[PDB]
Design a protein around this ligand. Structure first.
Ligand code: 6UI
Length: 277
């Protein structure tokens, strides 16, 4: 009778294995450090979470085990996880380009369409893998999308938006097993608008009004539609579809002409400009 015996998270001092090079983001996206393995010299990013209950901790440890089980080139690898002195430390592969939203704030501008296309394609590849393996992400947003040194995307988890449920699907707002595959697809659509406009739809509202606004409004569209291609606008319509029967799956979206793209050059250019700023 096969059974999982233990989590991958260890009850050990992370400092026994990892050196902290420095804090990343100066608090702008949480308590995050650049770290380096003492024996192997491998680089990592370490996120430290102060858990508030046994139940919260267990939920995180379950989620970490899922991440550890993923094997896809566009999903970040888990390098280590520790629980030590009331803190959860989660270490992933270091992604020298950082998070997509942090890049936008650094450069004070959104991604160009050619950049969004690449991010969309690679993130959709990761999301499709998850869905095919019966996993839902539930927190898709630009703060969970990371750039490598070579201009590829890695999907992460537990990210914080760089500086409220903006990415939540309307049926999930209205019906509180609430999250499912279709809800992730909606969140992808919101993330695309986030990358096109820096902030997601309804960012200007009082946050208390946001769920109501999502429930009662038509799906959001791009604020300046003449700046974007018909393919991008159509791809968005397939994600941001209130009728759950008509909202496209990740397998359908993979065939959409918007994500027919062969080169990550636009992202290499983006991160070279961020790196030189
Ligand atoms: C799943 O555990 C983690 C651990 C570190 C994380 C760091 C980030 C992050 N946010 C801004 N920059 C980073 C980051 C991630 C990897 N390499 C450099 C910077 C996002 C999600 C993370 C999630």
């Amino acid at each position: 009778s096969m059974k999982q015996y233990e989590h991958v998270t260890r009850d050990l001092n992370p400092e026994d294995f990892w050196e902290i090079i420095g804090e990343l983001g100066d608090g702008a996206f949480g308590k995050v450090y650049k770290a380096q393995n003492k024996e192997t010299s491998v680089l990592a990013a370490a996120k430290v979470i102060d858990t508030k209950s046994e139940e919260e901790l267990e939920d995180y440890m379950v989620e970490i085990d899922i991440l550890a089980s993923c094997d896809h080139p566009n999903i970040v690898k888990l390098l280590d996880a520790f629980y030590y002195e009331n803190n959860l430390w989660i270490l992933i592969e270091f992604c020298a380009g950082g998070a997509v939203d942090a890049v936008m704030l650094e450069l004070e501008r959104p991604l160009t369409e050619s950049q969004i296309q690449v991010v969309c394609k690679q993130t959709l590849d990761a999301l499709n893998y998850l869905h095919d393996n019966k996993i839902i992400h539930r927190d898709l947003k630009a703060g969970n999308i990371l750039f490598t040194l070579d201009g590829d995307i890695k999907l992460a988890d537990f990210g914080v938006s760089a500086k409220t449920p903006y990415w939540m699907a309307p049926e999930v707002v209205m019906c509180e097993r609430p999250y499912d595959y279709k809800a992730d697809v909606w969140s992808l659509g919101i993330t695309l608008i986030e990358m096109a406009e820096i902030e997601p739809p309804h960012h200007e509202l009082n946050p208390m009004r946001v769920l109501l606004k999502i429930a009662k409004s038509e799906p959001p569209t791009l604020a300046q539609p003449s700046r974007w291609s018909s393919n991008f606008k159509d791809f968005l319509k397939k994600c941001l579809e209130k009728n759950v029967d008509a909202r496209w799956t990740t397998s359908q979206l993979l065939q959409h002409p918007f994500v027919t793209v062969d080169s990550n050059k636009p992202i290499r250019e983006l991160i070279a400009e961020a790196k030189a700023e």
